[PDB]
Amino acid sequence: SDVLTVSTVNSQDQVTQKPLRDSVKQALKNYFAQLNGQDVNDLYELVLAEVEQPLLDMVMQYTRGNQTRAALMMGINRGTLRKKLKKYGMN
Amino acid sequence: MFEQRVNSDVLTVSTVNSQDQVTQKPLRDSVKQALKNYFAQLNGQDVNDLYELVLAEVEQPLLDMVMQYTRGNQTRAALMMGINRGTLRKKLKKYGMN
DNA sequence: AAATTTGTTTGTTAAATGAGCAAATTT
DNA sequence: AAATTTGCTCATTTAACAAACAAATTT
């Protein structure tokens, strides 16, 4: 049914799968909670910043540094991929 | 004085440790493990859409959550995400949030 | 009766793309 | 020594943008 998922344990020590989208809902339920109406500004860039980096690490780890297969896996262009590598100084 | 909160620490999730103790790990680690899990279970099948897959799994709840916050208001939501109100309206359509 | 937000459009800017190449690098 | 990937470039398609503004809505 749904492919991006993370392991959760309940009080009965049962491990169990739960979408990543549910974790993001939580990270942000929390983000806002701990603000007290202080303006947010760049939340799109913030969330994305934190999602691109682990995606890039993990697909470069998988494709043994091969930038070319990485781009093909992710479905982005070799250029794009490089640019993003510079952005996070991952090169 | 104020204490440093690194960017990893700004979006965080509730994890339990080897001592049955609740603690806040970065969201980025949850993304890392989602993908680890994902590769393990792939078994040499070709992939061609992993960016668009991760993006969809992430934008959908970023949107869902921000529009709850602005009690449905598209203008503030776009100001507070940092994107043009047109993109926002477009992304919202993309997932039928209207 | 405001003030704001929506829904839609326009022209402009910025980003992403594909193709091409020599020169490194892996095979 | 052949095959592939890198590190550029250029040019082209596509997305994101800010600025409008009448019509609907919320204050």
CATH of the domain at B17: 1.10.10.60
**Beta pairing, strands B22-26 & B12-16:** antiparallel
Bases of chain C below 7 A from a protein C-beta are: 4-10, 16-20, 27
| Contact yes or no for B28 and A72 at CB 8 A | no
| The amino acid at A76 | I
**A68 closest-nt by C1' vs CA:** D5
Q: How many CB atoms lie within 10 A of CB B8?
A: 14
| The amino acid at B82 | G
Phi-psi region of A65 (alpha: psi -120 to 50; beta: other; left: phi over 0): left
| The amino acid at B70 | T
Name the residues contacting strand D (CB < 7 Å): A 65-69, 78-79, 91; B 82-84, 86-87, 90
Domain that includes residue A76, residue range: 1-91
Contact residues for B6 (Cβ-Cβ < 8 A; gap 6+): none
| The amino acid at A80 | T
Q: Are B87 and B77 in contact (CB under 8 A)?
A: no
Question: CA nearest A30: which of B69, B62, B67, B12?
Answer: B12
Alpha carbon of residue B45 to chain centroid:
26
Elucidation method: X-ray
Q: Which residue of B has its CA nearest to A53?
A: B28
**Interfacial A residues in 31-60 facing B (CB < 8 Å):** 31-32, 39-51, 53-55, 57-59
DSSP for residue B48: S
| The amino acid at B56 | A
Chain B residues touching residue A27 (CB < 8 angstroms):
11-13, 27, 30
| Contact yes or no for B58 and A47 at CB 8 A | yes
Resolution for this model in angstroms, one decimal place? 3.1
- Specify the 3-state DSSP secondary structure of A6: strand
Give the separation between CA B41 and CA B47, rounded to whole angstroms.
12
According to DSSP H, which parts of chain A are helical? Answer: 20-34, 43-62, 67-74, 78-87
**A77 closest-nt by C1' vs CA:** C17
Q: Are B13 and A23 in contact (CB under 8 A)?
A: yes
Give the separation between CA A13 and CA A34, rounded to whole angstroms.
29
User: What's the structural domain count of chain B?
Assistant: 1
Give the separation between CA A67 and CA A78, rounded to whole angstroms.
7
| The amino acid at A44 | Y
Contact residues for A91 (Cβ-Cβ < 8 A; gap 6+): A82, A85
Cα of B62 to nearest chain A Cα, Å: 7
Spanning CA of A9 to C1' of D14, the rounded length in angstroms is: 44
Cα dist. A49→A7, A22, B26, B35, B50 in Å? 23, 18, 13, 16, 16
Give the separation between CA B50 and CA B54, rounded to whole angstroms.
6
Question: CA nearest A19: which of B11, B13, B68, B8?
Answer: B13
- Specify the 3-state DSSP secondary structure of A4: coil
Q: Are B23 and B15 in contact (CB under 8 A)?
A: yes
